[PDB]
């Protein structure tokens, strides 16, 4: 029978009738991403006024910061945000039905000699969002931006010496919005890799150094920072885990959570357990309860185990993945908890989407999330209603898990590009060095 299509979502259709677009790229970005976004909000039980509110802020404040509409046939900025280098991604917190999105701000100077590593554009996006949420605070943002991203003179140096960085993805920072209660919370993610190159320091040194400087004025983050650094040092110089980025909430320093992210190139349950417990340092009842759910998710998802290289820097659009990625975990430095809190990522990108959806659905049923369980797969298909669904192997980028207040928090991060009726407006998943199938 005729199946659900996200291009039918009413808020999408109504807003399309109302909006001014002065630029073809913004119009394309809207029609490419809004069907899925509107459908995701609807299915997550956002009220109709909230659906309008969040889509309008997205169109007016965010779309103009997404750059040219991405194609393989013209130059575009390649973002670390997705494997295809596109600068936008939706995520759903399945436990509390909160929609989130992340984007990499891009403007006219991005990738030119005025801003060759895209270190300046974020300020222009912040200019547009700030008036809408008076609780936004940039104190920590400013600190990490200064310490962990390229400044103008480092940018000029690296641009003139760009053979040092070749095909490296250049993203310095992204923003994320969590959509709740007619408001939004803003977060930043900061990528110190190129700052490490220009300074001759390691990412570890930059990140731990910057947080320690912050801890002079906010001493409450020091105990978990110290524990995290001890855990890291205990793994030795041949460790499979390495620090790669930081994030923080753009809110009052009293409340903001700093997260430090470790890439974990060993894909194994043992590696994920070691991260979850920080090498047996984090052993309390609630942690061990959460660990049983990590193990259940591990068993359901069936990631391809073993050591993983870094992948190709990006995939051209239209290309079917033939790859498996490292794991990742991050650690929150809670102001009221001496032990860092882990969140782990099951990196599913490249795996069969219908099998991942089945694993998620089983997990949802086991948690008694009966709404999520019966709607998830039908809704996911509606995002890409013209696709050969059983062959897809790139919709689920990763699944994140944390356990706090004895509550499982599971989020899915999903390909968000050319959704709904876009596709109408030789089975590669099963060849190459990996097999992906139902």
Residues at the binding site for dimethylallyl diphosphate are 100, 187, 189, 257, 259, 261, 343, 345, 409, 413
String of contacts with a second copy for each residue 60-89, x by CB under 8 A: ------------xxxxx-x-----------
Is the Cβ–Cβ distance between 246 and 275 less than 8 Å?
Answer: no
Residue 165 binds a second copy (CB under 8 A)? yes
Residue 437 binds a second copy (CB under 8 A)? no
- Determine how many CB atoms are found less than 10 A away from the CB of residue 199: 13
Euclidean distance between CA atoms 255 and 32, whole angstroms: 35
3-state secondary structure of 300: helix
The CA R_g of the chain, rounded to the nearest whole Å, is 21
Q: Which of residues 337-396 bind a second copy (CB under 8 A)?
A: 350-352, 355, 393
Nearer of residues 179 and 355 to a second copy, judged by Cβ: 355
Instruction: Determine the interface stretch with a second copy among 20-28, 142-150, 372-380, 429-437 (rule: CB under 8 A).
Output: 429-437
Q: What string of DSSP letters covers 157-217? A: HHHHTGGGTTT-----EEEEEEEETTEEEEEEEE-THHHHHHHT--HHHHHHHHHHHHTTT
Helices (H) and strands (E) in the chain, counts: 13, 12
Binding residues for L-tryptophan: 80-81, 89, 191, 244
Instruction: Determine the interface stretch with a second copy among 57-65, 113-121, 287-295, 309-317 (rule: CB under 8 A).
Output: 309-317
Rounded to the nearest 10 degrees, the angle between the axes of helix 139-148 and helix 203-214 is: 150
Among 124, 314, 377, 409, binds a second copy (CB under 8 A): 314
Q: What string of DSSP letters covers 228-279? A: HHHHHHHT-TT-SEEEEEEEEESS-TTTPPEEEEEEE-EESHHHHHHHHTTT
Among 134, 163, 270, 368, binds a second copy (CB under 8 A): 163
Nearer of residues 219 and 306 to a second copy, judged by Cβ: 306
Residue 324 binds a second copy (CB under 8 A)? yes
Q: What string of DSSP letters covers 140-167? A: HHHHHHHHHS--HHHHHHHHHTGGGTTT
Nearer of residues 49 and 313 to a second copy, judged by Cβ: 313
Nearer of residues 280 and 306 to a second copy, judged by Cβ: 306
Residue 200 binds a second copy (CB under 8 A)? no
Residue 236 binds a second copy (CB under 8 A)? no
Binding residues: 80-81, 89, 100, 187, 189, 191, 244, 257, 259, 261, 343, 345, 409, 413
Residue 408 binds a second copy (CB under 8 A)? no
Euclidean distance between CA atoms 349 and 94, whole angstroms: 18
Q: How many residues bind a second copy (CB under 8 A)?
A: 47
Q: Which of residues 88-127 bind a second copy (CB under 8 A)?
A: 111
- Determine how many CB atoms are found less than 10 A away from the CB of residue 395: 24
β-bridge partners, 48: none
**Closest separation between CB of residue 350 and a second copy, Å?**
6
Residue with tokens 């999330």: 369
Euclidean distance between CA atoms 89 and 66, whole angstroms: 11
Residue 211 binds a second copy (CB under 8 A)? no
Euclidean distance between CA atoms 354 and 363, whole angstroms: 14
Residue 315 binds a second copy (CB under 8 A)? yes
Distances (CA, A) of 329 to 104, 160, 225, 245, 282: 21, 35, 15, 11, 15
Among 49, 306, 338, 437, binds a second copy (CB under 8 A): 306
Nearer of residues 68 and 291 to a second copy, judged by Cβ: 68
Among 192, 224, 290, 321, binds a second copy (CB under 8 A): 321
Chain residues in the site for a second copy (CB under 8 A): 72-76, 78, 111, 162-163, 165-170, 304-306, 308-316, 318-324, 350-352, 355, 393, 426-428, 431-435
């Amino acid at each position: 029978m005729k199946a659900a299509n996200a291009s039918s979502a009413e808020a999408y259709r109504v807003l399309s009738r109302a909006f001014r677009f002065d630029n073809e790229d913004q119009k394309l970005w809207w029609h490419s991403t809004a069907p899925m976004f509107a459908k995701m909000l609807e299915t997550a039980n956002y009220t109709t006024p909230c659906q309008y509110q969040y889509l309008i802020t997205y169109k007016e404040c965010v779309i103009p910061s997404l750059g040219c509409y991405p194609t393989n046939s013209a130059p575009r900025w390649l973002s670390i945000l997705t494997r295809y280098g596109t600068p936008f991604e939706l995520s759903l917190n399945c436990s509390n039905s909160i929609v989130r999105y992340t984007f990499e701000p891009i403007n006219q100077h991005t990738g030119t000699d005025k801003d060759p590593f895209n270190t300046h554009a974020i300020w222009e996006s912040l200019q547009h969002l700030l008036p809408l949420e008076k609780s936004i605070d940039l104190e920590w943002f400013r600190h990490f931006k200064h310490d962990l991203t390229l400044n103008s003179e480092e940018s000029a140096f690296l641009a003139h010496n760009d053979r040092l960085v070749g095909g490296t993805i250049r993203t310095q920072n992204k923003l994320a919005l969590d959509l709740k209660d007619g408001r939004f919370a803003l977060k930043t993610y900061i990528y110190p890799a190129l700052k490490a190159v220009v300074t001759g320091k390691t990412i570890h040194e930059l990140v731990f150094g910057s947080v320690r400087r912050l801890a002079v004025r906010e001493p409450r983050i020091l105990p978990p920072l110290n524990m995290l650094e001890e855990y890291i040092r205990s793994r030795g110089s041949k460790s499979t885990a390495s620090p790669r980025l930081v994030s923080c909430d753009l809110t009052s320093p009293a409340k903001s959570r700093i997260k430090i992210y470790l890439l974990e190139q060993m894909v194994s349950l043992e590696a994920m357990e070691d991260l979850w417990t920080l090498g047996g340092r984090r052993r309390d009842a609630s942690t061990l309860e959460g660990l049983s759910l990590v193990r259940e998710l591990w068993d359901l998802i069936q990631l391809s185990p073993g050591l993983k290289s870094y992948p190709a820097p990006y995939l051209p659009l239209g290309v079917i993945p033939d790859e498996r990625l490292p794991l990742m975990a991050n650690f929150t430095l809670h102001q009221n908890d001496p032990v860092p809190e882990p969140q782990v990522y099951f990196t599913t990108f490249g795996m069969n989407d219908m099998a991942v959806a089945d694993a998620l659905t089983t997990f949802f049923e086991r948690r008694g999330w009966s709404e999520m369980a019966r709607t998830y797969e039908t809704t996911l298909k509606s995002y890409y209603p013209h696709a050969d669904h059983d062959k897809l192997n790139y919709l689920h980028a990763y699944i994140s898990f944390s356990y706090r207040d004895r509550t499982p928090y599971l989020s899915v991060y999903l390909q968000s590009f050319e959704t709904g009726d876009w596709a109408v407006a030789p089975d590669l998943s099963k060849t190459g060095v990996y097999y992906s199938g139902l």
